[PDB]
Design a protein that fits this description.
homotrimer, about 300 residues, alpha+beta, Helix Hairpins, atp-gated p2x4 ion channel fold, six-stranded mixed sheet, four-stranded antiparallel sheet, 5 helices, elongated, binds Camlipixant, binds a molecule of 2 linked components (NAG-NAG), binds 2-acetamido-2-deoxy-beta-D-glucopyranose, nucleotide-binding (chains A, B, C), extracellularly ATP-gated monoatomic cation channel activity (chains A, B, C), transport (chains A, B, C)
């Protein structure tokens, strides 16, 4: 009975190794998904509350949006020549800056004036590096993410709005309610291992990943999404700043421009999926390989038992 | 001759099962694609026709754009305190709204006035829910979609602009001309199983999918794209509304803001591909599995015939 | 010794064929990536230098941005009826244009006036096709691309900012330094097999592909990205033009609009990945198939040697 027991044990182990790793259930990874993101929540920046229309830069609500948390405004920028207001651009001789100095505000002319050598262009350049406050109440904003995915190979359409496992006081917590699509901005920042104060002050590119890992052999309700968070702006000047320009020409001839530098927390929504469904061909391939492996194991077992090595 | 005929039949069935499901022809699903969308067509909204530059929100023509169909304008919004114009925010006592009421227009102060308790912020809030007309002529807009895909594993570059199977009066109909890239907006809405009037009045997020399913073992001209349409904004307040803010500061000191609420039909272009090419390794694997399966079938056939069970 | 030598040679060839094509090392192609693009560099267009805030259309720095190189401005567009300024719309009789003529500037009315029959809408239409100069200094712009990828199946996070194989004078050249993420716009245009003058004058949609092809069986530092460039706006009127509209209502009642037509070079960043990691199941499958193929080869070899055919 030793040979039968040993071959049964070998076959059982081979089956465990195969079906545990899903040798069958051909896998599809080309998930086609659509994301609709909507921000809700109000906050104050200077002396005035700002609704959703203000801070979020892309109003459509695409896969990628920006939550603006700090604004630096430079108004009435006129064309001309003038020195730069930054420290690092010190000029002691007229030959210091030429076709070797990286421009910071405009095209250089090869001169030197007192405030720094003359960049040409928008004269009142950004006086940056100040103690401007941040939209602290943005720590309490909420993001509603409606994600609709469709695995094409198996024709499997699904969405994250699962009605079983209200939407007015629920948040997203991976422990209590890991299924509500409403993500608190403070919660997203905290779950990424980041302090919110520094992230809002300097800016960063967070990322929300919706892993659609499902086993289609089970029921339709079993396919559930998993939310994860990360930061994708780590080097090893870190930050995320971007500028809008609004132009106007007053009737007295001069051409003006106001420049708004925004430090925000850009959110990226990345959808990844991996769905495995049972298919005849991989099942046959795996069964044949398992049979041959069991045969090889049986051929080796008697030899190793007889030789005790 | 019975055994030879039976083994030939078993081998033929195994070959049918294998080659029908493409046991060989290793498959690649990581399709790298680029989409350029351009809208053409004019329509009237208030008392004036609007060209392409007006209704479409992203002027670049990215993978996702919005066809604005309804506009609600609130001009000269000033900062301050005032009640809200919506019905649902009824206030009979000063304690009704506090740290339990969801803000609708601004940060609450805990008071109660006649128009509703005081939200702080942009005072002339949106008087919404009106009978504003819709851009009905947007039913006749056309969308030109240039899609260029490149399967990287096989180095296979292709595009949907097939010159064989003019581009001035052709539309997209899956029956007559299922190859023209020009998609009528009314046609897209109709093919999604949606009435255009309600969709334009309330807004929605349609989706155009370009399935690049091809068999590279055939000629280059055989690889063709298939267009499909769906809606990806179905819960089970449905809609798709987004707001622009334009700011101006008149010389008499006050800070103003005009808010434009747009109800549009956002179009998402999703590209999915699955290309299978013959490879030596999967062919050998499939042949070995087929040989072993045929052997197993022959081993079972004589037994089942002799035992008649 | 002939049979042993022949079977060893057959086994060696089978192993070469299998391990060379990676029969083992299950492959994942669903790469989840995030791209942050930042443009640096100044240029002059009319009589004034323009910094980053001006030419690039999406200020956020998404996966797709546009480098504007030519601007055509039409100011003070008023609603009304007037003929069109283009040549192709010749009208000799009042019945020439009707429900058969493609509108170019507005909704037609079925009349004929001297400048061309009356389109309704923004009256001072674009007088296009001029000799407007181009932002030639945009040939010296630089693009910083920070790409962070994460293969989910193997949980493999990586980025293109490799610190071993400064970032102030380095460019991207596939021969000298093929690893610096700083891409010169002129270099990108040249590597796509395109002249920069015509591309800037008419517009085009270039594409930068970051192939993340790695072998995870080696060390972590071995996984490196490969940059490639292409053009995805080739038919077989080519170009890429898009228009912004800025509205204002002067106090004397009339409603105005200024239209800015931009000819740019839109850059698309496409991330593709294919990562193979050793797994037990594919290894067993490949070993079984190799054993069976070697057996078949041995069965055929003696026959072909004895029969000499
Ligand atoms: C006459 N009024 C103005 O000039 C003016 C008014 C403003 F409310 C603001 C302002 N500050 C902040 C601060 C935060 C955290 C969020 C939004 N903020 C805003 C509003 C908009 C202004 N944006 C714009 O594109 O405007 C062209 C870009 C996005 O932010 C400004 F920067 C300028
Ligand atoms: C002095 N003139 C204005 O204030 C004004 C003029 C306008 F034509 C309009 C207006 N209505 C509609 C209706 C449809 C269906 C499409 C486009 N529409 C527009 C034009 C733009 C105005 N957009 C903007 O970003 O403007 C900052 C956002 C997109 O729509 C407006 F909302 C305000
Ligand atoms: C009172 N001043 C103006 O009206 C005015 C001022 C300007 F600098 C310009 C202008 N020309 C060029 C040429 C290049 C190559 C790049 C940027 N350029 C610009 C600036 C902006 C204006 N953009 C805008 O959205 O403005 C609403 C869209 C993007 O280009 C303009 F088109 C109009
Ligand atoms: C974000 O919201 C939380 C939850 O309401 C705020 O925390 C509470 O704030 C109230 C304000 O009246 C205090 O009475 C509570 O004691 C706070 N609770 C806790 C646990 O701190 C929080 O202050 C808000 N954040 C910001 C920046 O305003
Ligand atoms: C969209 O275009 C269609 C096709 O031209 C319009 O339908 C025709 O409209 C003309 C207008 O002169 C009528 O004479 C025809 O009888 C209509 N034909 C049909 C089959 O209805 C349609 O009206 C346009 N839609 C909108 C909203 O203007
Ligand atoms: C882009 O930059 C290059 C590199 O600096 C410029 O080419 C040089 O331009 C300087 C200008 O003083 C000349 O002295 C050099 O002789 C040029 N070198 C070469 C090899 O041509 C180039 O002119 C710049 N392009 C534009 C359009 O301004
Ligand atoms: C126009 O007026 C502004 C202030 O409104 C002033 O700074 C500027 O010098 C004037 N420009 C001209 C050309 O008169
Ligand atoms: C400025 O003028 C506007 C109308 O143009 C008026 O409503 C407002 O009260 C005035 N504000 C101040 C601060 O004088
Ligand atoms: C308003 O003034 C503009 C010039 O500023 C002029 O062209 C236009 O005819 C005037 N419109 C009205 C309605 O008075």
């Amino acid at each position: 009975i030793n040979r039968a027991v040993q071959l049964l044990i070998i076959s059982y182990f081979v089956g465990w190794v195969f079906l545990h790793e899903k040798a069958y259930q051909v896998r599809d990874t080309a998930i086609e998904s659509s994301v609709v993101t909507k921000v809700k929540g109000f906050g104050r920046y200077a002396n005035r509350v700002m609704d959703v229309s203000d801070y979020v830069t892309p109003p459509q609500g695409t896969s990628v949006f920006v939550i603006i948390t700090k604004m630096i405004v430079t108004e009435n920028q006129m064309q001309g020549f003038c020195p730069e207001s930054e420290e690092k651009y010190r000029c002691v001789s007229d030959s210091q800056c030429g076709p070797q100095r990286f421009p910071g505000g405009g095209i250089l002319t090869g001169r030197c004036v007192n405030y720094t050598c003359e960049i040409q262009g928008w004269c009142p350049t950004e006086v940056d590096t100040v103690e401007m406050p941040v939209m602290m109440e943005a720590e309490n904003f909420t993001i509603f993410i409606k994600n609709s995915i469709r695995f094409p190979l198996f024709n499997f359409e699904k969405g994250n709005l699962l009605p079983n496992l209200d939407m007015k006081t629920c948040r997203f917590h991976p422990d209590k309610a890991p299924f509500c699509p409403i993500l608190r901005v403070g919660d997203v920042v905290k779950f990424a291992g980041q302090d919110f104060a520094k992230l809002a002050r300097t800016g960063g590119v967070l990322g929300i990943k919706i892993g659609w890992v499902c086993d289609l052999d089970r029921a339709w309700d079993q396919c559930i999404p998993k939310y994860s968070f990360t930061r994708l702006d780590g080097v090893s000047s870190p930050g995320y700043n971007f500028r809008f320009a609004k132009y106007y020409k007053m009737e007295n001839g001069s051409e003006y421009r106001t420049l708004l530098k925004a430090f925000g927390i850009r959110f990226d929504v990345l959808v990844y999926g991996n769905a495995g469904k049972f298919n005849i061909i991989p099942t046959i391939i795996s069964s044949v390989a398992a049979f041959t492996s069991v045969g090889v194991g049986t051929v080796l077992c008697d030899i190793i038992l007889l030789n005790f090595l």
